Coordinates of C-alpha atoms and ligand atoms in Angstrom, one line a residue:
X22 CA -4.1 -23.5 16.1
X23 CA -1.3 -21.0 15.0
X24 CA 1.1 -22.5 12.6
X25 CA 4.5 -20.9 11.1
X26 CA 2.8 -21.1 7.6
X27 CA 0.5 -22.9 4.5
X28 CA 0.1 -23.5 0.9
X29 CA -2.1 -21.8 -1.6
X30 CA -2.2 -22.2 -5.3
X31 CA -2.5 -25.9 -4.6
X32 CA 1.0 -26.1 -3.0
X33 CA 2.6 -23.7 -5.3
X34 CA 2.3 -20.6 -3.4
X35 CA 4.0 -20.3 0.3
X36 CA 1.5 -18.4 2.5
X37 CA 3.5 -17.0 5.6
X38 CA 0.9 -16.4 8.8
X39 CA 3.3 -14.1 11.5
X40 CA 5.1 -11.2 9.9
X41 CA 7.7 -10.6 12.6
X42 CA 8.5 -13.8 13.0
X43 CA 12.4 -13.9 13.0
X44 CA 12.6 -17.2 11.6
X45 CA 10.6 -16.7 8.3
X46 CA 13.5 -16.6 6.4
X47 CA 14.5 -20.3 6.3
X48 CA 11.2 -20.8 5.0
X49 CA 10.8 -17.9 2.3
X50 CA 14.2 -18.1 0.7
X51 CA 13.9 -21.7 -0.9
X52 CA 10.5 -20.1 -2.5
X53 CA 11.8 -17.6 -3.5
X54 CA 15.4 -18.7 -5.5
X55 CA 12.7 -20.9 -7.8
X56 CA 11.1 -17.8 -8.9
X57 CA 8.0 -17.9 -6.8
X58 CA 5.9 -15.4 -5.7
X59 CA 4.9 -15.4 -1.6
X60 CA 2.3 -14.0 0.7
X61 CA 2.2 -12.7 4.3
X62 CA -0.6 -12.4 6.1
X63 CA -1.5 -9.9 9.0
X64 CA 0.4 -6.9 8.3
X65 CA -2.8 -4.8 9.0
X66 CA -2.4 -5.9 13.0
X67 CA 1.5 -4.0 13.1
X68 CA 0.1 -0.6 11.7
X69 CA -1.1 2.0 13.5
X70 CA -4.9 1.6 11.6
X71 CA -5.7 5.8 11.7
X72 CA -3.1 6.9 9.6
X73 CA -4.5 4.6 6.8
X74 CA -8.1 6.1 6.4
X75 CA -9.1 7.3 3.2
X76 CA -11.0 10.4 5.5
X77 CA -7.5 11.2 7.1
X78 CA -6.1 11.1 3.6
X79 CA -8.7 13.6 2.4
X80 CA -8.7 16.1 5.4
X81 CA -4.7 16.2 5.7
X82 CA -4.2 16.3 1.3
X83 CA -7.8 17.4 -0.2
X84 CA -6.5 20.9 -1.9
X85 CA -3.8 19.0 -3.6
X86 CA -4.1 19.1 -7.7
X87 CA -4.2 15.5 -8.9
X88 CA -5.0 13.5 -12.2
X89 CA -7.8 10.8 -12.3
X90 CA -7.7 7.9 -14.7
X91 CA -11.2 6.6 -15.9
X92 CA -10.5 2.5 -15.4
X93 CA -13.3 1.6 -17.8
X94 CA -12.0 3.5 -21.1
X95 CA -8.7 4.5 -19.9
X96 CA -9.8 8.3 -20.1
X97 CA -7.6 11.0 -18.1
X98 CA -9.2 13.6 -15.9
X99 CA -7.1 16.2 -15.8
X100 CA -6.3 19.0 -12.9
X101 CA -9.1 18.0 -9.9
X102 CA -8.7 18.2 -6.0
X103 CA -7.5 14.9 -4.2
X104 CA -10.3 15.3 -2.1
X105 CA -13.1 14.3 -5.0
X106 CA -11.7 10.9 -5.1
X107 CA -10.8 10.5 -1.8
X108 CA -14.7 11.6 -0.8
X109 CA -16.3 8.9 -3.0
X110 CA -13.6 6.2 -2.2
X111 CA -16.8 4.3 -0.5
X112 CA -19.6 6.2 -0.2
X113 CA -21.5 5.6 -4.1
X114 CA -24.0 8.8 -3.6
X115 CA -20.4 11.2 -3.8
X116 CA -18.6 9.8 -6.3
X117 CA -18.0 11.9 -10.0
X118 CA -20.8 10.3 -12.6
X119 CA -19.6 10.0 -16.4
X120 CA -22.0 11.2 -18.9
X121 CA -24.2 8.3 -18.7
X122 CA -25.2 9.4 -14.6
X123 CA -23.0 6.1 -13.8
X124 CA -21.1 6.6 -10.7
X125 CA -17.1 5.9 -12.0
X126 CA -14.5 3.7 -11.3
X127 CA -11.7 5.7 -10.6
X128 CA -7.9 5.1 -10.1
X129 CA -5.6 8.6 -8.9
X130 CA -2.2 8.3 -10.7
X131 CA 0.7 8.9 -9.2
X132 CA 0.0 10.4 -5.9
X133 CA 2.0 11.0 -3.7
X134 CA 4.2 12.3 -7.1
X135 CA 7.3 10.3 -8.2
X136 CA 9.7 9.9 -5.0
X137 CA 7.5 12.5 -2.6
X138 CA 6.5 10.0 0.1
X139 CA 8.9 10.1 2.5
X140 CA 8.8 14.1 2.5
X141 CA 5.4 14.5 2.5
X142 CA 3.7 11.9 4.6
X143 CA 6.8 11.3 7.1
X144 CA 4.5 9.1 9.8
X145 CA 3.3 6.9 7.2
X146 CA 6.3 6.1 5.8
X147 CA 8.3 5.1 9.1
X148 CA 4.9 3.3 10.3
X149 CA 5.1 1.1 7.4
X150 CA 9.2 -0.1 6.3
X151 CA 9.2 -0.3 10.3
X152 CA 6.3 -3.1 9.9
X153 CA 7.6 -4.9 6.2
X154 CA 8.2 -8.3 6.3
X155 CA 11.2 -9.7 5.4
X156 CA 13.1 -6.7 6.5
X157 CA 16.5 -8.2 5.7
X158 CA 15.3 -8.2 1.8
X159 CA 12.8 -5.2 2.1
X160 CA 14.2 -2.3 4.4
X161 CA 16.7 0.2 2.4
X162 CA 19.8 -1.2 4.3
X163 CA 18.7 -4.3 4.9
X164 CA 21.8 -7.1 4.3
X165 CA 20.1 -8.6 1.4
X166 CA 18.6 -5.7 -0.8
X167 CA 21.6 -4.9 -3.5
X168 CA 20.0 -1.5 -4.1
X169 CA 22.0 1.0 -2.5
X170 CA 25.5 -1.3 -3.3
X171 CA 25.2 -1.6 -7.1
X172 CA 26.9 0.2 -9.9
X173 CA 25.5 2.1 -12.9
X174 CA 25.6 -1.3 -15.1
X175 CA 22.0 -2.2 -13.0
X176 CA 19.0 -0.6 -13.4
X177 CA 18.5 0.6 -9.8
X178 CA 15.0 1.1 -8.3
X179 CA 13.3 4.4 -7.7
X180 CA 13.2 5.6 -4.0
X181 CA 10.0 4.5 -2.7
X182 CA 8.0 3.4 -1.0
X183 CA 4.7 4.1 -3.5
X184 CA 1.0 4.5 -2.9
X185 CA -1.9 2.6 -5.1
X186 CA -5.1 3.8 -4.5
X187 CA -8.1 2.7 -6.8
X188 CA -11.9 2.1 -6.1
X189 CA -13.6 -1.6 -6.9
X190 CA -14.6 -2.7 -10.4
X191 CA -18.2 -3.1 -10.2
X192 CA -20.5 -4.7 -12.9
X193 CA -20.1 -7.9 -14.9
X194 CA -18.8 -6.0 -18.2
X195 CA -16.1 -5.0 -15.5
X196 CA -14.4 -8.3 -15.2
X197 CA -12.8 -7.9 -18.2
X198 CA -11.0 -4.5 -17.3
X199 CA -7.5 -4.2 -15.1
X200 CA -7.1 -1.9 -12.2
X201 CA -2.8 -2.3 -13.1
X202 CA -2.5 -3.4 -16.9
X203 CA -0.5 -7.0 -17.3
X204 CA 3.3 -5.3 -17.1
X205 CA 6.6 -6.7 -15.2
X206 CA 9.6 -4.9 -13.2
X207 CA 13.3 -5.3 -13.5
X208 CA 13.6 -5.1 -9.6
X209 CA 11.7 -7.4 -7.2
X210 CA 8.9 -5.7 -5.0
X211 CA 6.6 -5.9 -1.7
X212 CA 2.9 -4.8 -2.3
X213 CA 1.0 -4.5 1.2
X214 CA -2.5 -4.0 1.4
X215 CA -3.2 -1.2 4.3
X216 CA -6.8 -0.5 3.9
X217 CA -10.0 -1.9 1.7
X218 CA -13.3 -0.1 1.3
X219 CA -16.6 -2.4 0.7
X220 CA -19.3 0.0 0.2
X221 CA -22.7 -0.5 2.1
X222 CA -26.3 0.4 1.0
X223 CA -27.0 2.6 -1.9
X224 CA -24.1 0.9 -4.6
X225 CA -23.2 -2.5 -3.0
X226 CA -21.9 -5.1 -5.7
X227 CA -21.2 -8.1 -3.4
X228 CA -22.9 -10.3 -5.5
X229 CA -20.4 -10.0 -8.4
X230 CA -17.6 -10.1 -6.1
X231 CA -18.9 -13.6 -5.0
X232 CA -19.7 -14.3 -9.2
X233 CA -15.9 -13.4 -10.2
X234 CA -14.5 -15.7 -7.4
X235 CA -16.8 -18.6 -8.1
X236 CA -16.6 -18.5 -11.9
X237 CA -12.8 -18.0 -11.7
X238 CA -9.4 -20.2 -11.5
X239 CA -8.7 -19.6 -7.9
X240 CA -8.2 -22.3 -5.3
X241 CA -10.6 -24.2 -3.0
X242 CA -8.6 -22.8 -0.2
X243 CA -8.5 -19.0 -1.9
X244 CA -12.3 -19.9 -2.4
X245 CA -12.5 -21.2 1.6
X246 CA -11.4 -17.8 2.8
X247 CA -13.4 -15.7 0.6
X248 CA -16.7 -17.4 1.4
X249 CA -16.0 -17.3 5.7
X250 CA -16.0 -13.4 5.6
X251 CA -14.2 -12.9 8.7
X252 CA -11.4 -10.8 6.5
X253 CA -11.9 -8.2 3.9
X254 CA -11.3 -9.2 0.2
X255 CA -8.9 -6.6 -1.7
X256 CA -8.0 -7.4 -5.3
X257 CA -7.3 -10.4 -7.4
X258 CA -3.9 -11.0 -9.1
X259 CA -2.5 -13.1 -11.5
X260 CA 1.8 -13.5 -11.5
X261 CA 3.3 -15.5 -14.2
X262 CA 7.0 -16.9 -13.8
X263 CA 9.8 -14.6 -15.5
X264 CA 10.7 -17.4 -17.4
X265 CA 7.2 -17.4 -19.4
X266 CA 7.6 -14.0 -20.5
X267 CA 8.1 -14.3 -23.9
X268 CA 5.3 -17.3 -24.8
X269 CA 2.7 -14.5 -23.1
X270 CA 4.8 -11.9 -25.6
X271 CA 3.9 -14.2 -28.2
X272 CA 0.0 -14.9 -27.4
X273 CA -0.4 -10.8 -27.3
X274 CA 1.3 -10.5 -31.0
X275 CA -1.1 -13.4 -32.8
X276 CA -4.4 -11.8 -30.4
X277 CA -3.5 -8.4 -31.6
X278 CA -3.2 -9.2 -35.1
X279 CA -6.7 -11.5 -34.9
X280 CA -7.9 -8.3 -33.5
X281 CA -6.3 -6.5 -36.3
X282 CA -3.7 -4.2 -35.0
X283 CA -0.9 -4.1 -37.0
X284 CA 2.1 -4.3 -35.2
X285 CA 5.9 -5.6 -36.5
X286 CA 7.2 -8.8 -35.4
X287 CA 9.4 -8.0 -32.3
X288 CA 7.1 -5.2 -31.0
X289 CA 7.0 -6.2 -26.9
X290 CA 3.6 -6.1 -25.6
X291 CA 3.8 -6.9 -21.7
X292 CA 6.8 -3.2 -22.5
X293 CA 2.9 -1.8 -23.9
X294 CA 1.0 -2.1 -20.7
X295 CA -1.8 -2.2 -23.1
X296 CA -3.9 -5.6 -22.1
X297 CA -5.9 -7.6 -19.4
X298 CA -6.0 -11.5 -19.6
X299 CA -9.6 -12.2 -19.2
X300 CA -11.0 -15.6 -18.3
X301 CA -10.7 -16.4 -22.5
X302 CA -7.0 -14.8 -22.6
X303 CA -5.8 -17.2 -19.4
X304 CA -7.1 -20.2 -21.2
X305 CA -5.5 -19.5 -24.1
X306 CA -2.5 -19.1 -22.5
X307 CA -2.5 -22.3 -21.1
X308 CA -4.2 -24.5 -23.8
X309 CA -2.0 -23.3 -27.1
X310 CA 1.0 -22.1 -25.1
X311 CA 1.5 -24.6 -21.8
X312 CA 1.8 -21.3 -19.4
X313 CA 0.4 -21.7 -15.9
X314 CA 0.2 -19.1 -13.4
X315 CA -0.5 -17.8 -10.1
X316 CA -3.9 -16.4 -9.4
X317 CA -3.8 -14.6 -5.6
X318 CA -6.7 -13.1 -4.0
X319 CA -4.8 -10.2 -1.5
X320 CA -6.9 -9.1 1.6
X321 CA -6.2 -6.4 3.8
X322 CA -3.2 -6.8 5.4
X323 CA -1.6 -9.4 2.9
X324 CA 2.2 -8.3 2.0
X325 CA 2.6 -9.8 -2.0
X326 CA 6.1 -10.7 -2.9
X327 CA 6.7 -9.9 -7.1
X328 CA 10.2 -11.1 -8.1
X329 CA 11.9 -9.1 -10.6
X330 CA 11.1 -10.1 -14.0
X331 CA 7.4 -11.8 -13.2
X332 CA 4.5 -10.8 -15.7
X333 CA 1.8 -9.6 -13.2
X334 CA -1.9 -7.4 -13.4
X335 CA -4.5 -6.7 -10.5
X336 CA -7.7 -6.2 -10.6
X337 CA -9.3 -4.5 -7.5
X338 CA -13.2 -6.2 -6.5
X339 CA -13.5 -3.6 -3.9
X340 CA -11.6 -0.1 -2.9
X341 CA -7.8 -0.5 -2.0
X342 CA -4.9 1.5 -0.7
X343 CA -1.8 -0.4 -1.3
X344 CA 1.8 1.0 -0.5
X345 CA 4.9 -1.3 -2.5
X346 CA 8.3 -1.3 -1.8
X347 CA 10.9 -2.4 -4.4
X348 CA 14.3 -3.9 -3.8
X349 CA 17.2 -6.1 -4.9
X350 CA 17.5 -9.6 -3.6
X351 CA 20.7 -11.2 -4.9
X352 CA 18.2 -14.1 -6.1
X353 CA 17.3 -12.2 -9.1
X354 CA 19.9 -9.5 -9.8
X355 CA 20.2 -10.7 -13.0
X356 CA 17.3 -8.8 -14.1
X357 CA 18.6 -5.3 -13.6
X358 CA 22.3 -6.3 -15.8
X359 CA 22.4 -4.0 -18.5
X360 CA 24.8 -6.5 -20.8
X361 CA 24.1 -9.6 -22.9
Ligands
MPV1 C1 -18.4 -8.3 1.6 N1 -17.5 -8.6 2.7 N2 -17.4 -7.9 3.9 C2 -16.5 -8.6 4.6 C3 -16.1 -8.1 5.9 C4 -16.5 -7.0 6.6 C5 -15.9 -6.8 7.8 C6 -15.0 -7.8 8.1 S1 -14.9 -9.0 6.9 C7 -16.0 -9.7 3.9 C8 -16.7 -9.7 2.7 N3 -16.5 -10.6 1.6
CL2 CL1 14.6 -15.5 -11.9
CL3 CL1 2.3 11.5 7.7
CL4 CL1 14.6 -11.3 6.6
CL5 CL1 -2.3 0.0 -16.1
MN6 MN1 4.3 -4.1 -10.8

């Protein structure tokens, strides 16, 4: 039967089911002054599904000049079409092969370019803040985003919203490697899931999908939905609490130094965007330091809530185009203050 909502995370994470319900607030807004993440399910169901096609994408925006980062080495290709990653976003046999004849796991940086959504892909951008959940917190003038009301001592947002668009990390040596680098934001944000790719014949890797999930720190009810099929798998997060920030600062200064970087004492490696926390790192973390997190597994359509100030990194297990919208709940406004 339909219900207003559930728990993940073992009660810890509110899981919203109807994303135009006008009602959700008195549920979310409890959640969310504790400094919890949230998830809405079923987005995908309000958009209009042929605008979000990686082919579309390619015919509309091939001859576009992009850059390519290499997500197993960090490598930059520099100066290609759009078109030769959109064309191998699921089909294996066309994507660009690194010098070992491997096919690549490729993310395209910062496309659309900085603030250009809006001008260039006009239909998409009024198909999705018209759809975003929350829209009191999330639209541009909504009553409860602070954005467009605050003066210069806040770090404002960027105009958004903003496209992520990477393929699937594929082998077991993958597992180890991010898709976004742990990192945090001074403003909160809304990441929805609009599309995912799970190739078919020739390079399928559902095996190590199922391997990551099983072997991994997820829920029984996380665990539940991956294992029915029925809905498409996208990427796996983890979100810490803002308030653990600087225990996981100190974990990356003492691993980096084991590893022998040298580094001085105040350096701020989450600032770095340098690291992953593997399997080993999350233990770690939780053993010698007491932190706990949030792992989320986001399927298409699922609308992840990031509140300012939250440690976070994703790590895609099959192709996704996300879009994110950030914004200025009065819950966490201190974050952007530029004093004391
Ligand atoms: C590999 N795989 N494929 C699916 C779906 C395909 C179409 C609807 S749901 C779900 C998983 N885990
Ligand atoms: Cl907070
Ligand atoms: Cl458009
Ligand atoms: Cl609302
Ligand atoms: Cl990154
Ligand atoms: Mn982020």
């Amino acid at each position: 039967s339909m219900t207003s909502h559930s728990w993940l995370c073992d009660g810890r994470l509110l899981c919203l089911h109807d994303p135009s319900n006008k009602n959700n607030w008195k549920i979310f807004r409890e959640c969310w002054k504790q400094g919890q993440p949230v998830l809405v399910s079923g987005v995908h169901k309000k958009l209009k599904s042929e605008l979000w096609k990686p082919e579309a994408f390619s015919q509309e925006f091939g001859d576009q000049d992009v850059d390519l980062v290499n997500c197993r080495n960090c490598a930059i290709i520099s100066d290609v079409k759009v078109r030769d990653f959109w064309d191998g976003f699921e089909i294996i046999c066309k994507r660009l092969r690194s010098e070992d004849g491997q096919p690549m796991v490729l993310k395209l940086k910062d496309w659309p370019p900085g603030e250009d959504f809006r001008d260039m892909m006009p239909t998409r951008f009024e198909d999705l803040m018209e759809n975003l959940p929350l829209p009191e917190y999330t639209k541009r003038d909504g009553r409860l985003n602070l954005a467009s009301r605050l003066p210069s001592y806040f770090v404002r947002p960027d105009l958004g919203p903003k496209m992520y668009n990477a393929y699937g990390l594929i082998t077991a040596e993958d597992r180890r490697v991010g898709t976004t680098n742990l990192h945090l934001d001074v403003s909160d944000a809304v990441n929805v899931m609009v599309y995912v790719g799970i190739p078919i014949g020739e390079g399928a890797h559902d095996e190590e999908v199922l391997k990551t999930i099983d072997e991994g720190d997820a829920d029984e009810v996380t665990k539940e939905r991956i294992h029915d099929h029925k809905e498409k798998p996208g990427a796996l997060w983890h979100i810490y609490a803002a308030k653990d920030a600087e225990k996981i600062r100190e974990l990356l200064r003492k691993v980096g130094e084991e590893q022998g970087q040298e580094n001085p004492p105040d350096h701020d490696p989450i600032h770095d965007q340098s690291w992953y926390l593997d399997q080993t790192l999350r233990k770690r973390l939780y053993e010698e330091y007491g932190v706990q997190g949030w792992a989320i597994v986001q399927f298409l359509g699922d609308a992840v809530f990031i509140p300012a100030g939250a440690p976070h990194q994703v790590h895609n297990l099959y192709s996704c185009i996300k879009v994110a919208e950030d914004f200025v709940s009065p819950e966490h406004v201190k974050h952007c203050f530029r004093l004391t």
